[PDB]
């Protein structure tokens, strides 16, 4: 009935994982498959007081403890099968002709995602449906659209990232917030932050929500505030205590804190759909300002872009403004941050894709369009890893089962802009394949890609800022 979608999704994730991973055939430093294999090799062979010190120049440890524990567990379960994979300094750059160790990892990612990402999202759509009396098919379609999101399905199965876990823990947090277990939503978010630290792009919203719900909105409830402030601290302490007691002491806490949050080197040296990749080609910030000034202006710029939403929640917290304020905050962090990368649009895409359960058609059209644009801004990354066939197959299937081949917001100024964005996409996959760069601007198509995505992201961002204020007017919670 409705369990064949949950199986077709896993078969899709399995078949997308027959293409080359990030870094195949690259001797000196392989891709992100080799980083993860190295962590699985390093955690189970060194004491807990050398994980963040061991070898910082060959794929050191960049993520908080929970990632280390995850890698330790998988490394044990995998060094059971074949030990010569995760050997210390011997099996460095391990590539097998049989394609062993390329199936074990591709299956560990599938398992971790099945555990930490499918139930969260499925229960979210179920709660929404049952609360709004959505036809079982109405829930099943909104739940199939959320599981075939191409950007994540290609950045995990095909590039080998463990992002489904970091996003599923945050979906658990949002579910707890819905069911009104705040003391446990605090804990699930503190876990989601300790897997990958790029989940701090929601803290400005979770904090305001919990605070206004505890001490401001209904009453000045001082017990709930204590329960939340103790859940947070107990979870932080239980996750960081193994580094302290079994590690070295405060030295280990300091080294981990500075491995997670590293200093910035360079100035706008990567091509992102940022506010700075797009204006650094006219203003040439490298020739006008210093790096201190740019690191200060980016902070002011991101804090001024998430303040209006943080305050709208902290002053009017409700359960129908959560997706929009989450978008308003995370996309603000993505557009104006000093150092952003091609990925990290998955963080703004979690709340976005969550809006595939809305009832309107303008909302669903904007959602599908921004998903296509988000996938499109990842072609330069998925083109140097192979993945030409998987990119196209996912790009086609996702749009097909939605109904995008049988569709736009309602206006003359919306349909035209959306069709123009599509026409300027379909003209980059023709200046990229056939016609050669001008030979005097070596990377001119990559810049058209950094630039044609920023416009769409910064229009969707303002659309969300509009929905926050036009809605939130004693609005439904059924819309």
């Amino acid at each position, epitope marked *: 009935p409705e369990y064949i979608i949950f199986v077709c999704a896993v078969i899709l994730r399995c078949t997308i994982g027959l293409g080359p991973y990030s870094g195949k055939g690259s001797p000196p430093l392989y891709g992100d498959f080799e980083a993860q294999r190295h962590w699985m090799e390093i955690t189970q062979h060194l004491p807990l007081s050398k994980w963040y010190w061991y070898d910082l*120049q060959y794929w050191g440890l960049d993520y908080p403890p929970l990632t280390a524990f995850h890698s330790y567990l998988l490394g044990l379960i995998g060094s059971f099968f074949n030990p010569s994979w995760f050997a210390l300094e011997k099996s460095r750059g391990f590539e097998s002709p049989d394609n062993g160790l390329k199936t074990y990892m591709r299956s560990t990612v599938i398992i971790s995602d099945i555990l930490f990402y499918f139930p969260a999202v499925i229960y979210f759509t179920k709660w929404l449906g049952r609360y709004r009396n959505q036809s079982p098919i109405g829930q099943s379609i909104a739940a199939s659209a959320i599981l075939f999101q191409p950007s994540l399905m290609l950045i995990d199965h095909g590039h080998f990232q463990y992002n489904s876990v970091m996003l599923g823990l945050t979906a658990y947090a949002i579910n707890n917030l819905l069911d009104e277990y705040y003391a446990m939503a605090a804990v699930c978010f503190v876990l989601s932050i300790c897997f990958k630290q790029m989940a701090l792009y929601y803290a400005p919203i979770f904090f305001a929500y919990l605070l206004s719900r505890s001490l401001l909105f209904p009453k000045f409830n001082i017990a709930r505030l204590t329960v939340i402030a103790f859940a947070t601290l107990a979870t932080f302490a239980i996750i960081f205590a193994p580094l302290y007691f079994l590690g070295g002491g405060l030295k280990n806490i*300091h080294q981990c804190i500075h491995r997670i949050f590293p*200093f910035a*080197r360079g100035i706008f040296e990567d091509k992102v759909a940022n506010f700075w990749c797009v204006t650094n080609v006219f203003v040439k910030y490298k020739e006008r300002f*210093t790096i201190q000034q740019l690191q200060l202006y980016s*902070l002011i710029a991101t804090v001024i872009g998430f303040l209006p939403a943080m305050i709208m929640t902290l002053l009017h917290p409700k359960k129908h403004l959560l997706p929009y304020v989450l978008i308003a905050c995370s996309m603000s962090f993505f557009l104006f941050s000093f150092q952003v990368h091609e990925k990290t649009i998955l963080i703004p895409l979690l709340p976005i894709t969550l809006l595939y359960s809305s009832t309107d058609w303008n909302v669903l059209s904007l959602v599908s369009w921004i998903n296509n644009v988000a996938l499109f801004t990842l072609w330069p990354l998925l083109k140097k890893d192979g993945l030409h066939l998987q990119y196209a197959v996912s790009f086609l299937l996702s749009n097909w089962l939605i109904g995008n081949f049988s569709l736009l917001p309602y206006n003359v100024v919306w349909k035209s802009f959306i069709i123009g964005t599509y026409i300027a996409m379909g003209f980059y996959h023709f200046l990229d394949q056939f016609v050669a760069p001008p030979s005097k601007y070596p990377d001119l198509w990559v810049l058209l890609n950094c630039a044609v995505g920023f416009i769409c992201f910064s229009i969707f961002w303002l659309w969300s800022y509009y929905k926050i204020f036009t809605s939130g007017s004693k609005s439904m919670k059924d819309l």
Partner: antibody
Amino acid sequence: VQLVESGGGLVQPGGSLRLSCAASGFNVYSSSIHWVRQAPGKGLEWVASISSYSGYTSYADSVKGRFTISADTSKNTAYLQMNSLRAEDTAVYYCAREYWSWYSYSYGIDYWGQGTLVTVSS
Amino acid sequence: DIQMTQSPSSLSASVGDRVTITCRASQSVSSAVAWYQQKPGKAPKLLIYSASSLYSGVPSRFSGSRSGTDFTLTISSLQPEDFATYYCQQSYWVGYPITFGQGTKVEIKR
């Protein structure tokens, strides 16, 4: 808080040397050590770096491919290894610690060592 | 790729004069410019950092400043314990090399 150099003297042109810099009063796993030489009758010159929060090294092209700098993090020590030792290397070597912070705000080379003399000659 | 042009290499002054040393970088990509002093034979001593912030324990008469790429060190009252060599120094970020100026030997006049 005081650094101390050790190890340096008459070495034939072509030999090698291991300069040690013992730290005392602060942790070198957070201070981004630098080495800096002053030649006899010249101006202060920079040779090699080490960051120690990510182990990013960096050298002066004069001494690239011949020097190797590292830091023993447990015992709070820094080491420089000179291998080819051209004759244009006699100098007074200092180890200096520079403390950086968030948002690219540094505090300068506030702690110097009294320097040790290298005489690459014959 | 990263250099500092100190100006000049030699200038005389009497006990009490006001002194100013300039130092210009091939590109203004970081205001992390520190000013060090060195007596003959001893190790340098940090006078100013961040190009304007005075160290702790340094006299009050030392003031730095920046104008684009023309950093400057000002001694508003040159006292008898101020004749030495003075170096600028610029650094871009952590994993990057640094560079010292050439040296401005201040001496007494007669």
